[PDB]
A and B are shown apart, each in its own frame.
Chain A
Amino acid sequence: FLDTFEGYFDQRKIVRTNAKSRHTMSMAPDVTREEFSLVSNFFNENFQKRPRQKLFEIQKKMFPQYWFELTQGFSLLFYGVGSKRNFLEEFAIDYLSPKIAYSQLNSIPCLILNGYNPSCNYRDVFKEITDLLVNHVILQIQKMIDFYKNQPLDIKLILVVHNLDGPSIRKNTFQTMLSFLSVIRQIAIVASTDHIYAPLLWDNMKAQNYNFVFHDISNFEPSTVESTFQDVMKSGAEGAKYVLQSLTVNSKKMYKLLIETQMQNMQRTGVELKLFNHLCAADFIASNEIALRSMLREFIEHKMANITKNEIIWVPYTYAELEKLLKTVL
Chain B
Amino acid sequence: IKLFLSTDDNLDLSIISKYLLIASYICSYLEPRYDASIFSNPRYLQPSLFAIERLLAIFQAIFPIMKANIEVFQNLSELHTLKLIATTMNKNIDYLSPKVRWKVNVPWEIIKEISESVHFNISDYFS
Contact = CB atoms under 8 A, between A and B. Distances in A.
A59 to B, nearest CB: 21
B96 A5 contact: no
Contacts of B119: none
Interface in A196-210: 197-207
B59 to A, nearest CB: 9
A200 B40 contact: no
Contacts of A214: 70
Interface stretch (A89-97, A168-176, A259-267, A300-308): A168-176
B64 to A, nearest CB: 14
Contacts, number: 67
Interface stretch (B5-13, B42-50, B74-82, B104-112): B74-82
B124 interface: no
Contact of B57 (A5, A167, A171): A5
A9 interface: yes
A134 to B, nearest CB: 31
Interface string B57-76: 11011000000001001101
A201 B52 CA distance: 13
Given A10-B40, A14-B33, A207-B74, A197 B60 contact: no
B57 A203 contact: no
B36 interface: yes
A173 B60 contact: no
Interface residues of A toward B: which range? 20 to 34
A12 B77 CA distance: 26
A171 B97 CA distance: 10
Contact of B77 (A6, A14, A171, A199): A199
B116 interface: no
B92 interface: yes
Nearest to A200: B73
Contacts of A10: 36, 40
B57 A199 contact: no
A167 B99 CA distance: 13
22 contacts: A4-B60, A5-B61, A9-B57, A10-B40, A14-B33, A170-B94, A170-B96, A171-B94, A172-B92, A197-B52, A198-B73, A199-B74, A200-B52, A200-B77, A200-B96, A202-B77, A203-B77, A203-B78, A204-B74, A205-B78, A207-B74, A214-B70
Interface of A: 4-6, 8-10, 12-14, 165, 167, 170-173, 195, 197-207, 214
